[PDB]
Amino acid sequence: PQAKILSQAPTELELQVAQAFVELENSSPELKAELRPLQFKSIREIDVAGGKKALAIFVPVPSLAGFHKVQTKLTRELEKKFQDRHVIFLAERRILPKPSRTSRQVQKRPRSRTLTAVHDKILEDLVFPTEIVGKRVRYLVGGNKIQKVLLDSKDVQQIDYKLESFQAVYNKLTGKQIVFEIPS
RNA sequence: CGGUAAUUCCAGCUCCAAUAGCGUAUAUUAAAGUUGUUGCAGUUAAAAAGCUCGUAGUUGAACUUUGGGCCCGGUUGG
């Protein structure tokens, strides 16, 4: 089972979570149907303030639309089984380097593989249930940048307590500071 | 400027400027932001074409690897 729900089974933490999938799939006749085709590729643990950790789960991008039907419940369940964790799902995306004037030619680089485009999609996935309603960028006199992301005040209670963990996760993946705000 | 009564003509004194050199004519440069790339002007002083379309010419919005770590590291100053 486990090596057939992982796209590879190299390490034990994925085996723990893989088991939880198999367990939960039995506990309800509903999940027995929905969860069966899903798979995930890798997991990374990122430490954050207050001693907690983020379970960043990486998913094949053509299947991402499936998880969005089951991402609720799954977060409820997994945060019980792995006590003191925050769980978030991310699609894996390529990024291709920018061509130099010296390089030999290759097929034209699709715009979705640019670095700017990929980082925007990452941020969209973190806050998944809510929509982003705007962005700001601040250029401080010290010579450094901060982004502010504004969230739709809808169902925010599902993520309202996680925001500090999102800041830490995003920094690890990119090196960029962000803060979250919720317009009334 | 000069028609008597001359600070301007003519002469005599005195004085000034450059000086082995000084003056005149013609051309050209600066002065000239009176040819304007730097850098002009066009209500009333010279100068916006009766009006619109349109080829050559001149000109044309934004976007694609950014940021963060670790070594070596030359020059100058204390």
UniProtKB/Swiss-Prot annotation:
The keyword Ribonucleoprotein applies. There is a cross-link at K80, K81, K121 (Glycyl lysine isopeptide (Lys-Gly) (interchain with G-Cter in ubiquitin)). It is found in: Cytoplasm; Nucleus, Nucleolus. One of its GO terms (cellular component) is nucleolus. GO terms for biological process: cytoplasmic translation; ribosomal small subunit biogenesis; ribosome biogenesis; rRNA processing. It comes from the Eukaryota. Keywords: Acetylation, Cytoplasm, Isopeptide bond, Nucleus, Ribonucleoprotein, Ribosomal protein, Ribosome biogenesis, rRNA processing, Ubl conjugation. N-terminally acetylated by acetyltransferase NatA. Ubiquitinated at Lys-80 and Lys-81 in response to stalled ribosomes, leading to activation of the No-Go Decay (NGD) pathway: first monoubiquitinated by MOT2/NOT4, followed by formation by HEL2 of 'Lys-63'-linked polyubiquitin chains on monoubiquitin. InterPro entries: Ribosomal_eS7 (IPR000554), Ribosomal_eS7_CS (IPR047861). Present with 41000 molecules/cell in log phase SD medium. There are 2 genes for eS7 in yeast. Belongs to the eukaryotic ribosomal protein eS7 family. PANTHER family: 40S RIBOSOMAL PROTEIN S7, SMALL RIBOSOMAL SUBUNIT PROTEIN ES7. Component of the ribosome, a large ribonucleoprotein complex responsible for the synthesis of proteins in the cell. The small ribosomal subunit (SSU) binds messenger RNAs (mRNAs) and translates the encoded message by selecting cognate aminoacyl-transfer RNA (tRNA) molecules. The large subunit (LSU) contains the ribosomal catalytic site termed the peptidyl transferase center (PTC), which catalyzes the formation of peptide bonds, thereby polymerizing the amino acids delivered by tRNAs into a polypeptide chain. Component of the small ribosomal subunit (SSU). Mature yeast ribosomes consist of a small (40S) and a large (60S) subunit. The 40S small subunit contains 1 molecule of ribosomal RNA (18S rRNA) and 33 different proteins (encoded by 57 genes). The large 60S subunit contains 3 rRNA molecules (25S, 5.8S and 5S rRNA) and 46 different proteins (encoded by 81 genes). Interacts with snoRNA U3. uS11 interacts with MPP10. Component of the ribosomal small subunit (SSU) processome composed of at least 40 protein subunits and snoRNA U3. This is Small ribosomal subunit protein eS7A. It comes from Saccharomyces cerevisiae (strain ATCC 204508 / S288c). The lineage of its organism: Eukaryota, Fungi, Dikarya, Ascomycota, Saccharomycotina.
